[PDB]
Amino acid sequence: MRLGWIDPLPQVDTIFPLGLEPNVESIPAGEVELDFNLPETIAKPFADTVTSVGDRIQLVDDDKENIATSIYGLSFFKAARQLYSTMLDHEKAVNQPLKAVYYDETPIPAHMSGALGIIGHMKTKVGDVLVKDAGVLFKRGTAAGVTKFSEIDNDKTWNLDCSKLVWADHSSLSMIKRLASEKISQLVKQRYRVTDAQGHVYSVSMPQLTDQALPDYYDSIPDVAPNSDQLRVLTAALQMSLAQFRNDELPHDEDRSDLLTTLDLLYADGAYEISALRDQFELLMARYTTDFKWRVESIFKVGPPPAGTTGYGAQTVSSTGNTARWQFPLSDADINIGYLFSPSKSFSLFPKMVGYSKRAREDASASFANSDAKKFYAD
Amino acid sequence: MRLGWIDPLPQVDTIFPLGLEPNVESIPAGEVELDFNLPETIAKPFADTVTSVGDRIQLVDDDKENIATSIYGLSFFKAARQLYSTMLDHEKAVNQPLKAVYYDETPIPAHMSGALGIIGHMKTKVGDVLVKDAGVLFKRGTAAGVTKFSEIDNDKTWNLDCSKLVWADHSSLSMIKRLASEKISQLVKQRYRVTDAQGHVYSVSMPQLTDQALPDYYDSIPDVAPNSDQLRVLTAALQMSLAQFRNDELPHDEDRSDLLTTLDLLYADGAYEISALRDQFELLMARYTTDFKWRVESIFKVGPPPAGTTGYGAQTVSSTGNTARWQFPLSDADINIGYLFSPSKSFSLFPKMVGYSKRAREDASASFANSDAKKFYA
Amino acid sequence: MRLGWIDPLPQVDTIFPLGLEPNVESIPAGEVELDFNLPETIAKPFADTVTSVGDRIQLVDDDKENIATSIYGLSFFKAARQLYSTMLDHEKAVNQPLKAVYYDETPIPAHMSGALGIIGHMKTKVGDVLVKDAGVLFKRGTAAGVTKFSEIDNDKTWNLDCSKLVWADHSSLSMIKRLASEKISQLVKQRYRVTDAQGHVYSVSMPQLTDQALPDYYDSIPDVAPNSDQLRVLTAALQMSLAQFRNDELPHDEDRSDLLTTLDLLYADGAYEISALRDQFELLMARYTTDFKWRVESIFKVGPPPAGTTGYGAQTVSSTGNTARWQFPLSDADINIGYLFSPSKSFSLFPKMVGYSKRAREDASASFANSDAKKFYAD
Amino acid sequence: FPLSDADINIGYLFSPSKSFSLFPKMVGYSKRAREDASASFANSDAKKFYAD
Amino acid sequence: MRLGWIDPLPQVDTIFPLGLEPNVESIPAGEVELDFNLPETIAKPFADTVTSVGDRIQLVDDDKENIATSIYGLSFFKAARQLYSTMLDHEKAVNQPLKAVYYDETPIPAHMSGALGIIGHMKTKVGDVLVKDAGVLFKRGTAAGVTKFSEIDNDKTWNLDCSKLVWADHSSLSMIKRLASEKISQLVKQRYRVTDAQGHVYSVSMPQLTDQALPDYYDSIPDVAPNSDQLRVLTAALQMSLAQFRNDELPHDEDRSDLLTTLDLLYADGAYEISALRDQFELLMARYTTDFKWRVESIFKVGPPPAGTTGYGAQTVSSTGNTARWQFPLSDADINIGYLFSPSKSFSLFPKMVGYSKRAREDASASFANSDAKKFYA
């Protein structure tokens, strides 16, 4: 039943009565980062195709656009539904407020559905490989649909770059802090030559956040150091609690507007605030049902929105030009679909197993050796 | 068939024949770093019974000890054989001189032979997983056997920690160079204060060797920076040419003596020089045949030494007390033998596949989508 | 099995045991030069017809044009596919970069397909008759489609006379040099009267490029001679290597801009450069699939694009008025189709066979004569 | 060149030859240029993404 | 059975059992001189598709060019392998050092492998037809691959026309000596006038080197005779000992520099020295594995390199335009592959058989005849 990844060793069972059973030592087994625009990459072909089939019911140019715009937004909403459908029980839980996005079953073009069906966490013969920052993604994906739809009317209430939004929850905070660490070590690679009373040019660089205490690391930042400001904000973020993040009370009296403007994120608040998104979604959906559903379904062969429990290999494919690249063995369907929408940003498989023996190694070894024993000293 | 690691996509139709067949891009697709002592860990149990059972037979003192020593020595010699057997074409070419080690078929305790069989490069469903630094290891494993056997006569000609030895061939060079980069990005993590007129004592570190050219990096090293001298040597080493390394003429006039002492290595020359080992091996073998073979073979059921084509999953396990630890799915015997000898220091799998397409994505998608268009009827 | 072109000779077999078997001494056996606009000549009727059937789905005037424009471009692309499909293996090889043009199977009007099916190299009971400069044509045909499509939007990036394009490859160079030789001998037919210290009017003319060495022929060109400049450029071209053609380093320090402006060609570069054409093709095709395919297929009965292995007799027909002309015997289908689209510019059949005898002519003759021998001296 | 026994024997009895040369010369014509034929030969190992 | 080349004599009876069985006397019974460029001619088509298809994939510029270069280099390396594989026992012995070239089994485009299979000595119904100067060629073919691969890095260490290289082994020597005789009987055809007091201007030429001894022939060379200096060198060369040639101490104090420059050859030493090539090969191979193997194998369906026992008729064909030309009967595939790569420069078949007889011809004939005698009747 175990992954036939490599040829098994042919051996004598003197050893066999040990008990070493495989146990998943670390969770999860892998991780996949999805390209935010995946929903758009998929919607695109359909949206465009509207210029053709839209004629089946004689749609004016203006209407053709709205229909297409809907297909983009619809794609986002349905991709969210899918992702949410595959989330770990805790994530489905915390994201309860926007579950209407998951519940809604508005039909979409058949193949459009099939493609979307590839996203979400995936269970594999190696363990669970999760969609990185799924919680954040789920909300961004949701915000995006709310924004695309808000184009039907120049309503500027929802007019941000959803691909940068972060909320005041742990899922976001956790990501914030990670992007902080990465950003730091990226800056600490620069070199500024501080000329001292000693010697001349001293091509040097800011210390790496190795073993210092966060508070201390902050102090020890040379006002002179390149991007010395950012290092301050970022180090502060690595400290800040969820609480402080809400109230803009970043440890070393730092501004959240900087932390965000540094990592190039936007603070999802006001309009893009969860409960607001809910209402907005429910409305746009109602509108879609009364103003476009009929048109969309009169143009395309539609089917039910994906909402399964696993994602697929395709999520691990990257495309550029006429080449497609993946890592672990994929089926053809996965390679093809993967090639069409180059869905992944990164992908890591890091399984870790552990087993326990009921025998000390010294004894087990002893037996192994006693196999070649001769009569004069065998049992 | 391909690796059935995850479930296949429910054949999302259409998509003309893009021709995306799979191709391995990563050669190798993974590496395993075996524990230098594996052959010792294996012989241990047998060598041991040679000490316990010894007394009941008339095998005692110097003798008992030599028989036991032999087993460790043969263990290294036989493990070398195996490794060589599974080396890439050119790897065998380069080690041509020590091919006598590969040919020798002296019997060994049967199960000891079986265990050594796990050693070597592996062919796997994701590509080729190689034994990191095989060339260096094959030579170390060989020197180790010559060294162990030397204990029989106390002959101190071969008296060195074989784990550290490095020769003047390319295999060893790459290793030196890698171990250098390791050290640099390791030392550079250290801090030191620069008390300046303008702004009191600072706190900075030696700049990471990023995109800067080796030459300049060398110069730009302040004597004040912790381990200033070493950074110099190691940087210089990153520049060496196999020839330079072989003649102690390291760029920026550094000493091989330091480069090696910094990386806690030893230069295999004089006695441990390839050629010399070859001869000594031949003698040790002819000596073993006459003098110890009979005892060794009267204590154990022996069998032919391994000489397979591939290593095995087992090489991927790590042990401590009563726990084993591995990464990717192994058979049972692989996990078992693995727990008994804890063969690996580290293991990395990192596949990369590639496919080519007749058409670009735009039209491919435009079509995929077009299948949902409804036909203008009446 | 041999071409029953003429009545066979009735003869006695004393001779017959010779071995003279026919072998193709020279390749190819023939050559056909196609009228560049053949794709347009064919598309035309369909493009026009759109004004009628376009109504089946109520197309606005603007859209009707784009649809038609597409049919022109589509014709070019599919004609290229066909030609490429019949090319000798070396040509298919060198032209590998634009093979997407060959691969694409977008449907076109049924009869439009049938007509296009006539183009390309043709295997005959006399040998292979090739489409002259097929390689160059294939690219020009391709460039043309890319240009027609670039009219849907006034995109002037692709706005040249594809019928004059030449690239930096051997197929083009080879043609260049040929057009040079022809051009020369066309100019060397003029007469300029150089009055000397000797006599008066000396109606003379520039020497013919008979046996001179190219370098020498260049020098010996009288500054006075009519179109003396051209003779210089052209003679230079006859020398230039492929290498020099790229870098504008024409032997006798001549400008490529002249060589081209003389033979009335354009240097395909920048926009019309192979790899650029590829990308451009892939895009326009994608666009066609999403903006017109449905419309086109809702108007016409469409079929698969030609892509066979042989061209047909029709390629050798010329039309003018109500008369149609060809050379070697053609079927009716070939004459008719040929008449509708007057596809050829020129056509030559120059087969060359060679055979070897196992007997010297003197012996074979001897035997032939011994047939009428009488008893007193026969064997 | 290889002879039958009868030929070797009779030949041995009367040593009939002073000299002997075999200098055959064959020639063949292809209906395809070498460059094309070569192209095809190579296209045999072609993969899907660029085969016909 | 024997070669059924001609019709068998209608069994002219009698003749007691003389015992005239056939025996090959000519060893070899024929030779083929392969065109040094055969491996290039073969790789051409493949290397080419690597340039055309390259662009559609993301393979471009330096890269596209290196992949293509590899194919030429592997073509030489693999053609060497083949040739060595079919060499006579001692031929392999002498080239022992470069045996790594023979062992390497790196895959190549399948049909490219198939084509290289035509290379090598042949076993035939008339004796053994050998590849003239195999030793020299095997080494040239090897140097060629090392040289081609050097283009990847522009490394000009290996920058020579490998077709000319000659080493200081016997294989090369015989060649030198032969090429010498060639030149002499070639230059000696030239005339020069000797205006004498007794009888005006004459017209004579340097005497053909017939039965005269090399030493004397040397002296007897008039500075006036066209190409006087060369005749000297070449004659001297006919006298050299492998040792002399190897140390530039040519008899009659001539210079190897001239001998080689006369015969438009090059002395393989320094970089192109046997040993050096061995090492460089091993590196090139380890480099190819990591860096180019994946691309090469993703463009073509590859297969194992040839390593047969015999070459084939194909090696006997010559091509030009659309005509092929051979001498003795070849199969169809032999004529075809032959026309595609025009592998031969020259080809000579020259069998010689021998038989022994128990009795002399006189009595043998006297008997043959006696069978027609009539028996005295009554």
Tab-separated table of C-alpha atoms in Angstrom, chain E residues 60-327:
chain	number	residue	atom	x	y	z
E	60	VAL	CA	18.126	29.662	-27.019
E	61	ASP	CA	21.477	31.263	-27.763
E	62	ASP	CA	24.453	29.972	-25.811
E	63	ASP	CA	22.315	27.116	-24.537
E	64	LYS	CA	20.845	26.050	-27.852
E	65	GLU	CA	24.374	26.082	-29.194
E	66	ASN	CA	25.851	24.000	-26.370
E	67	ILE	CA	23.222	21.285	-26.669
E	68	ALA	CA	23.959	21.102	-30.380
E	69	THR	CA	27.708	21.042	-29.687
E	70	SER	CA	27.229	18.162	-27.244
E	71	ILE	CA	25.675	16.009	-29.939
E	72	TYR	CA	28.739	16.424	-32.171
E	73	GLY	CA	31.026	15.656	-29.257
E	74	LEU	CA	29.077	12.600	-28.150
E	75	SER	CA	28.980	11.517	-31.769
E	76	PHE	CA	32.793	11.367	-31.822
E	77	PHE	CA	33.019	9.785	-28.357
E	78	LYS	CA	30.447	7.117	-29.280
E	79	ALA	CA	32.013	6.398	-32.664
E	80	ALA	CA	35.326	5.827	-30.839
E	81	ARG	CA	33.612	3.408	-28.504
E	82	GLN	CA	32.308	1.412	-31.468
E	83	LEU	CA	35.631	1.288	-33.298
E	84	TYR	CA	37.512	0.189	-30.177
E	85	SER	CA	34.876	-2.471	-29.600
E	86	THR	CA	35.720	-4.043	-32.937
E	87	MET	CA	39.525	-3.713	-32.741
E	88	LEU	CA	41.905	-6.696	-32.867
E	89	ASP	CA	43.160	-8.056	-29.537
E	90	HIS	CA	46.481	-6.181	-29.557
E	91	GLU	CA	44.859	-3.006	-30.921
E	92	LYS	CA	42.746	-2.850	-27.766
E	93	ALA	CA	45.837	-3.644	-25.695
E	94	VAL	CA	47.799	-0.702	-27.059
E	95	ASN	CA	44.889	1.672	-26.453
E	96	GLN	CA	44.344	0.306	-22.945
E	97	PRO	CA	44.548	3.864	-21.402
E	98	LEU	CA	41.575	5.204	-23.317
E	99	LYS	CA	39.433	2.188	-22.435
E	100	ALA	CA	37.205	4.501	-20.391
E	101	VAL	CA	35.927	5.834	-23.730
E	102	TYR	CA	34.815	2.305	-24.609
E	103	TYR	CA	33.079	1.665	-21.310
E	104	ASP	CA	30.990	4.841	-21.149
E	105	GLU	CA	27.372	4.060	-22.033
E	106	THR	CA	25.792	7.481	-22.289
E	107	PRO	CA	22.588	7.250	-24.405
E	108	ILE	CA	22.345	9.058	-27.745
E	109	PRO	CA	19.536	9.675	-30.243
E	110	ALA	CA	18.490	6.119	-31.113
E	111	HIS	CA	19.040	6.293	-34.877
E	112	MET	CA	22.292	8.168	-34.356
E	113	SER	CA	23.358	5.133	-32.373
E	114	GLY	CA	22.185	2.806	-35.095
E	115	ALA	CA	24.231	4.685	-37.719
E	116	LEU	CA	27.441	4.595	-35.675
E	117	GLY	CA	26.986	0.835	-35.607
E	118	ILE	CA	28.306	0.542	-39.167
E	119	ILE	CA	31.792	1.501	-37.959
E	120	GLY	CA	34.508	-1.124	-37.417
E	121	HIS	CA	36.541	-4.059	-38.753
E	122	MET	CA	34.605	-6.653	-40.726
E	123	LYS	CA	34.612	-10.443	-40.825
E	124	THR	CA	33.849	-11.479	-44.417
E	125	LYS	CA	33.606	-14.466	-46.763
E	126	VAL	CA	37.075	-13.648	-48.126
E	127	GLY	CA	38.905	-12.764	-44.940
E	128	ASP	CA	39.208	-9.789	-42.616
E	129	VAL	CA	38.591	-6.316	-44.017
E	130	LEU	CA	40.115	-3.806	-41.579
E	131	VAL	CA	39.614	-0.103	-40.867
E	132	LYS	CA	42.978	1.281	-41.987
E	133	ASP	CA	44.932	2.922	-39.140
E	134	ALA	CA	42.317	2.142	-36.488
E	135	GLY	CA	44.689	3.065	-33.657
E	136	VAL	CA	45.322	6.507	-35.063
E	137	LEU	CA	41.658	7.031	-35.901
E	138	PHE	CA	40.389	5.823	-32.488
E	139	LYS	CA	42.666	8.398	-30.829
E	140	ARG	CA	41.740	11.157	-33.319
E	141	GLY	CA	38.026	10.399	-32.901
E	142	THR	CA	38.582	10.738	-29.127
E	143	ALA	CA	40.550	13.969	-29.306
E	144	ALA	CA	37.841	15.320	-31.597
E	145	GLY	CA	35.176	14.843	-28.941
E	146	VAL	CA	37.291	16.481	-26.253
E	147	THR	CA	37.970	19.307	-28.672
E	148	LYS	CA	34.344	19.778	-29.699
E	149	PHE	CA	33.218	19.851	-26.073
E	150	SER	CA	35.826	22.503	-25.384
E	151	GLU	CA	33.853	24.902	-27.545
E	152	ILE	CA	31.152	24.963	-24.857
E	153	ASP	CA	33.510	27.006	-22.643
E	154	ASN	CA	35.637	28.520	-25.410
E	155	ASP	CA	38.475	26.873	-23.496
E	156	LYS	CA	41.220	26.957	-26.131
E	157	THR	CA	43.470	24.404	-24.433
E	158	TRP	CA	42.068	21.864	-26.875
E	159	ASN	CA	42.227	23.885	-30.050
E	160	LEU	CA	43.654	21.831	-32.938
E	161	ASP	CA	42.615	20.152	-36.172
E	162	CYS	CA	42.249	16.646	-34.784
E	163	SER	CA	42.255	15.115	-38.261
E	164	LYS	CA	46.026	15.763	-38.428
E	165	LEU	CA	47.114	14.588	-34.969
E	166	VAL	CA	49.635	11.752	-34.701
E	167	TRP	CA	50.940	10.241	-31.499
E	168	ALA	CA	54.277	8.586	-30.763
E	169	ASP	CA	53.008	5.003	-30.847
E	170	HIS	CA	53.513	2.394	-33.539
E	171	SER	CA	50.100	2.808	-35.151
E	172	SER	CA	50.930	6.434	-36.003
E	173	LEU	CA	54.465	5.581	-37.051
E	174	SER	CA	53.467	3.146	-39.790
E	175	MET	CA	51.116	5.787	-41.071
E	176	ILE	CA	53.883	8.423	-41.085
E	177	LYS	CA	56.186	6.006	-42.942
E	178	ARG	CA	53.500	5.155	-45.522
E	179	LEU	CA	52.560	8.784	-46.127
E	180	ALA	CA	56.269	9.373	-46.641
E	181	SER	CA	56.652	6.811	-49.424
E	182	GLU	CA	53.514	8.336	-50.908
E	183	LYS	CA	55.086	11.815	-51.071
E	184	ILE	CA	58.434	10.662	-52.452
E	185	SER	CA	57.036	8.746	-55.446
E	186	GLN	CA	54.854	11.834	-55.828
E	187	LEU	CA	57.554	14.530	-55.776
E	188	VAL	CA	59.973	12.407	-57.820
E	189	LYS	CA	57.593	12.760	-60.770
E	190	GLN	CA	58.795	16.346	-61.140
E	191	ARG	CA	61.359	17.466	-63.715
E	192	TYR	CA	64.234	19.995	-63.734
E	193	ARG	CA	66.761	20.932	-66.466
E	194	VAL	CA	70.492	20.246	-66.063
E	195	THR	CA	72.333	22.585	-68.518
E	196	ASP	CA	75.687	20.801	-69.133
E	197	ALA	CA	78.835	21.797	-71.070
E	198	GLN	CA	78.569	18.427	-72.854
E	199	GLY	CA	75.128	18.617	-74.496
E	200	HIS	CA	72.993	21.695	-73.720
E	201	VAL	CA	70.089	21.766	-71.234
E	202	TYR	CA	68.806	18.238	-70.449
E	203	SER	CA	65.629	17.264	-68.624
E	204	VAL	CA	65.668	14.719	-65.834
E	205	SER	CA	64.010	13.851	-62.512
E	206	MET	CA	64.934	12.661	-59.057
E	207	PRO	CA	65.410	8.879	-59.300
E	208	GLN	CA	62.570	6.754	-57.950
E	209	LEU	CA	63.436	5.157	-54.624
E	210	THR	CA	63.605	1.636	-56.022
E	211	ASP	CA	66.208	-0.815	-54.708
E	212	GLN	CA	68.668	1.774	-53.410
E	213	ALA	CA	69.371	1.845	-49.638
E	214	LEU	CA	67.742	4.633	-47.653
E	215	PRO	CA	71.072	6.132	-46.489
E	216	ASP	CA	72.497	6.497	-50.001
E	217	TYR	CA	69.183	7.682	-51.387
E	218	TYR	CA	69.387	10.542	-48.867
E	219	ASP	CA	72.830	11.702	-49.971
E	220	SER	CA	72.102	11.271	-53.694
E	221	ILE	CA	69.592	14.108	-53.454
E	222	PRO	CA	70.665	17.219	-55.451
E	223	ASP	CA	69.658	20.566	-53.952
E	224	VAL	CA	68.650	21.563	-57.466
E	225	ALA	CA	65.935	18.871	-57.727
E	226	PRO	CA	62.447	20.318	-57.051
E	227	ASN	CA	61.514	19.932	-53.359
E	228	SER	CA	65.014	18.806	-52.463
E	229	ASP	CA	64.577	19.528	-48.767
E	230	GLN	CA	61.364	17.577	-48.436
E	231	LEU	CA	62.764	14.471	-50.137
E	232	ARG	CA	65.523	14.604	-47.523
E	233	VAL	CA	63.139	14.793	-44.553
E	234	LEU	CA	60.756	12.127	-45.832
E	235	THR	CA	63.620	9.746	-46.673
E	236	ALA	CA	64.964	10.313	-43.187
E	237	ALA	CA	61.500	9.544	-41.846
E	238	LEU	CA	61.496	6.210	-43.686
E	239	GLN	CA	64.533	5.476	-41.493
E	240	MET	CA	63.308	6.770	-38.082
E	241	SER	CA	62.852	4.457	-35.112
E	242	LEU	CA	59.784	5.030	-32.943
E	243	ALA	CA	62.253	6.324	-30.359
E	244	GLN	CA	63.940	8.751	-32.759
E	245	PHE	CA	60.574	10.145	-33.877
E	246	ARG	CA	59.543	10.597	-30.257
E	247	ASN	CA	62.689	12.646	-29.467
E	248	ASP	CA	63.088	14.749	-32.629
E	249	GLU	CA	66.419	13.024	-33.322
E	250	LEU	CA	65.622	12.082	-36.903
E	251	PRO	CA	68.377	10.333	-38.882
E	252	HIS	CA	70.508	12.618	-41.076
E	253	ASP	CA	69.697	15.278	-38.509
E	254	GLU	CA	66.321	16.305	-39.935
E	255	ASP	CA	63.571	18.109	-38.014
E	256	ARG	CA	60.340	16.485	-36.931
E	257	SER	CA	58.945	19.984	-37.356
E	258	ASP	CA	59.473	19.685	-41.106
E	259	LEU	CA	58.550	16.012	-41.419
E	260	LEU	CA	55.200	16.857	-39.835
E	261	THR	CA	54.701	20.138	-41.634
E	262	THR	CA	55.562	18.420	-44.923
E	263	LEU	CA	52.892	15.770	-44.345
E	264	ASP	CA	50.549	18.386	-42.942
E	265	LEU	CA	50.331	16.509	-39.618
E	266	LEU	CA	50.455	17.655	-35.978
E	267	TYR	CA	52.288	16.130	-33.046
E	268	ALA	CA	49.848	15.193	-30.321
E	269	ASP	CA	51.574	16.198	-27.096
E	270	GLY	CA	50.965	18.499	-24.170
E	271	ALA	CA	47.170	18.749	-24.063
E	272	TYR	CA	46.432	16.132	-26.755
E	273	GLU	CA	48.741	13.668	-25.016
E	274	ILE	CA	46.930	10.295	-24.406
E	275	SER	CA	46.912	10.585	-20.631
E	276	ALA	CA	45.606	14.185	-20.641
E	277	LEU	CA	42.706	13.243	-22.915
E	278	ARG	CA	41.741	10.432	-20.545
E	279	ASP	CA	41.281	12.827	-17.619
E	280	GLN	CA	39.594	15.521	-19.649
E	281	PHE	CA	37.188	12.918	-21.045
E	282	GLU	CA	36.191	11.867	-17.561
E	283	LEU	CA	35.459	15.482	-16.688
E	284	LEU	CA	33.559	16.205	-19.853
E	285	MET	CA	31.444	13.143	-19.175
E	286	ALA	CA	30.656	14.083	-15.574
E	287	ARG	CA	29.877	17.598	-16.756
E	288	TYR	CA	27.623	16.393	-19.601
E	289	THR	CA	25.641	14.184	-17.194
E	290	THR	CA	24.604	17.046	-14.944
E	291	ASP	CA	24.429	19.966	-17.311
E	292	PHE	CA	23.288	18.770	-20.727
E	293	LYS	CA	22.031	15.190	-20.482
E	294	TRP	CA	18.502	16.255	-19.530
E	295	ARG	CA	17.976	18.585	-22.515
E	296	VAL	CA	19.532	16.208	-25.035
E	297	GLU	CA	17.317	13.394	-23.767
E	298	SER	CA	14.166	15.528	-23.776
E	299	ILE	CA	14.623	16.423	-27.436
E	300	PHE	CA	15.338	12.931	-28.751
E	301	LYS	CA	14.288	9.353	-28.195
E	302	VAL	CA	17.620	8.020	-27.079
E	303	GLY	CA	19.146	4.573	-26.953
E	304	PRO	CA	22.355	2.826	-25.808
E	305	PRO	CA	25.544	3.569	-27.773
E	306	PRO	CA	26.643	0.898	-30.221
E	307	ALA	CA	29.426	-1.466	-29.201
E	308	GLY	CA	29.308	-4.288	-31.740
E	309	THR	CA	31.875	-6.804	-32.978
E	310	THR	CA	31.884	-5.955	-36.668
E	311	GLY	CA	31.407	-3.005	-38.965
E	312	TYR	CA	29.304	-3.254	-42.119
E	313	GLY	CA	29.195	-3.009	-45.867
E	314	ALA	CA	27.877	0.554	-45.574
E	315	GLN	CA	31.416	1.697	-44.651
E	316	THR	CA	32.160	1.011	-48.333
E	317	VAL	CA	29.870	3.615	-49.910
E	318	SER	CA	30.666	7.110	-51.280
E	319	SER	CA	28.179	9.882	-51.907
E	320	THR	CA	27.867	13.033	-53.979
E	321	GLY	CA	24.651	14.858	-54.693
E	322	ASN	CA	22.151	12.090	-55.376
E	323	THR	CA	24.520	9.264	-56.303
E	324	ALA	CA	26.088	6.523	-54.209
E	325	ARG	CA	29.003	4.420	-55.339
E	326	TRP	CA	30.387	1.103	-54.085
E	327	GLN	CA	32.371	-1.887	-55.342
